[PDB]
Amino acid sequence: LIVNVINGPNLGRLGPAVYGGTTHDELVALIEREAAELGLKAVVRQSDSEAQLLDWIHQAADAAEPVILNAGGLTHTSVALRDACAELSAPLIEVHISNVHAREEFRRHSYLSPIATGVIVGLGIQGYLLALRYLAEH
Amino acid sequence: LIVNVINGPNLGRLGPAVYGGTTHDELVALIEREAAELGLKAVVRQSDSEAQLLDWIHQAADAAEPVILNAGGLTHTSVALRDACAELSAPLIEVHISNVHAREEFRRHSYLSPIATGVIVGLGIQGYLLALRYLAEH
Amino acid sequence: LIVNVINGPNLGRLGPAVYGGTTHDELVALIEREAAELGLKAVVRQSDSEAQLLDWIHQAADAAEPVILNAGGLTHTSVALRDACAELSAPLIEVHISNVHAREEFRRHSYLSPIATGVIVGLGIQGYLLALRYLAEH
Ligand SMILES: Cc1ccc2sc(COC3=C[C@@](O)(C(=O)O)C[C@@H](O)[C@@H]3O)cc2c1
Ligand SMILES: Cc1ccc2sc(COC3=C[C@@](O)(C(=O)O)C[C@@H](O)[C@@H]3O)cc2c1
Ligand SMILES: Cc1ccc2sc(COC3=C[C@@](O)(C(=O)O)C[C@@H](O)[C@@H]3O)cc2c1
Ligand code: NA
Ligand code: NA
Ligand code: NA
Ligand code: NA
Ligand code: NA
Ligand code: NA
């Protein structure tokens, strides 16, 4: 029923060559609308602070709620975030707006992918909506 | 006399397969009791925020107090934390509850170990108590 | 006209073998004086918090202002900081007080250098003043 969508650093700045022209507020609106259509309730949060992201992951773990996570640059760097996410009992779907495999080599490594249920990259902001649909059909 | 025990991200969540069933509050109690038995005063702090950890390390450097540090995932990732710890004039003992050498390869690298006095891993929460005893006998 | 000088973790602690004996407050004074002589206004900020640094970079991007950045240990570790800096339309000059190429191997890699206009290392705190002079003559 409840799905948490958590966005990490810089994703508040959305709005165009690499990440598209959709703003973060528009993304929240699109996600909330799609969730409603699927019979879910999406709670969307964004922070540039790793400690804040960790707290939101901890809350999802305590509530046994699924998470759709776009960790931004922390994807490639944060073991702390990986360890928080490893506590999740419900599914974790990693989303990247851009195709990280077509960019710098450092972006092709994720600490999160090995512990995620699955990963969607390169499908733009529709990746979040597709992640929701996965969760609704499961 | 005063020893600072600093715990990094996710260690507030303690309480069981990998890290044991002892909670962070219980750990603080056990450490305070052992410190008292050894004639020390332990000040135990935990944060998921790297900036907060840095501030506590800075304070220990200014006070010339020893530190027992379990940096959590930041062990493997944070040069900033290493540099703060390199300022410490009193001993630094790195502690890990789990045997990081028996886990993923990324956990086998520490930015802290080269600048620590010593390192204890895999002995559970008793590692903190053994670190205290080292400091008391030195 | 306005130049932002942003200092990352531990740089508040300046004041001597590796980084010199000039304190952060003295550095701010020296930078402000040099900026005035060059007809610039320098805004100098320091934080141990990556989220705070990101916010200051975001502000510079929105204002189309140049940045002189000494990211401290985050130089070697933070993709999030690199991505924020990649948004800057005005020049980015990376400065390191110490000669990072004469130190540990991990310090010889920077996420920032590939997206910076240029990089000054090893010239002490004069590196900041030289960065200002570059910006004034450009
Ligand atoms: C105006 C602006 C300026 C810089 C940046 S950086 C950013 C998102 O950071 C990241 C997101 C990814 O997760 C993705 O493709 O969704 C890839 C990851 O490598 C990158 O750090 C969004 C964004 C927006
Ligand atoms: C409920 C729960 C869920 C996830 C996590 S992660 C964690 C501590 O993080 C780490 C601690 C270590 O320092 C250690 O063995 O003490 C190893 C380090 O690799 C790891 O990130 C504790 C903890 C507790
Ligand atoms: C009292 C004290 C104790 C520890 C530290 S660490 C620090 C700055 O950190 C860094 C700065 C550099 O950017 C540089 O040469 O300016 C190099 C970088 O590798 C390092 O982390 C300044 C500082 C001051
Ligand atoms: Na929630
Ligand atoms: Na899309
Ligand atoms: Na203390
Ligand atoms: Na134990
Ligand atoms: Na400014
Ligand atoms: Na100098």
3-state helix, strand, coil in chain B (%, to 5): 50, 20, 35
User: What Å distances lie between residue A49 and A24, A77, A86, A122, CA to CA?
Assistant: 16, 14, 19, 24
Mutation to test the A interface, candidates C79, C89, C106, C112, most A Cβ within 10 Å? C79
Name the residue facing C13 among B82, B87, B111 (closest C-beta): B87
- Technique employed here was X-ray
Please report which residue ranges of chain C form alpha helices under DSSP H: 24-38, 50-63, 79-85, 126-137
Chain A contact present for B77, CB below 8 A: yes
Structure tokens at C85: 């800096």
Q: Which of C19, C24, C134, C138 is catalytic?
A: C19
Angle subtended by helix axes C126-137 and C24-38, to nearest 10: 20
From chain C, the residues in CB contact with B84 under 8 A are 9-10, 13
Residues ≥6 apart with Cβ < 8 Å to C33: none
Mutation to test the C interface, candidates B47, B74, B75, B79, most C Cβ within 10 Å? B79
How many angstroms separate the most distant Cα atoms in chain B? Answer: 39
Domains detected in chain C: 1-138 (3.40.50.9100)
Structure tokens at B61: 């450097």
Cα C129 to averaged position of ligand 5 atoms, centre (Å): 45
Place of tokens 């990072």: C100
Half-sphere exposure of B133 (CA within 13 A, CB side): 7
Structure tokens at C21: 């004996």
Which of B40, B37, B15, B51 minimizes the C-alpha distance to B93? B40
Give the alpha-carbon dihedral of A25, A31, A36, A42, to 10 degrees. Answer: -90
Angle subtended by helix axes B50-63 and A50-63, to nearest 10: 120
Q: How far apart are the two ends of chain A, measured CA to CA in Å?
A: 11
> Nearest 5°: phi and psi at A87?
-80, -20
- Atom of ligand 2 at shortest range from CA of B96: 16
Q: Tell me the sheet residues that pair with A106.
A: none
What are the DSSP calls for C92-113, one per residue? EEEEESS-GGGS-GGGG--SSG
Q: Is A70 in the pocket of ligand 1 (CB under 6 A)?
A: yes
Ligand nearest to the CA of C56: 8
Chain A contact present for C53, CB below 8 A: no
- Atom of ligand 2 at shortest range from CA of B11: 22
Cβ pair A81, A113 in contact under 8 A: no
C19 classed as catalytic: yes
Radius of gyration of chain C (CA): 14
Residues ≥6 apart with Cβ < 8 Å to C29: none
Write the burial class of residue C112 (CB in 10 Å: 0-12 exposed, 13-18 middle, 19+ buried): buried
Assign residue A122 a region: left if phi > 0, alpha if psi is -120 to 50, beta otherwise?
Answer: left
Q: Is A125 in the pocket of ligand 1 (CB under 6 A)?
A: no
Write the burial class of residue A21 (CB in 10 Å: 0-12 exposed, 13-18 middle, 19+ buried): exposed
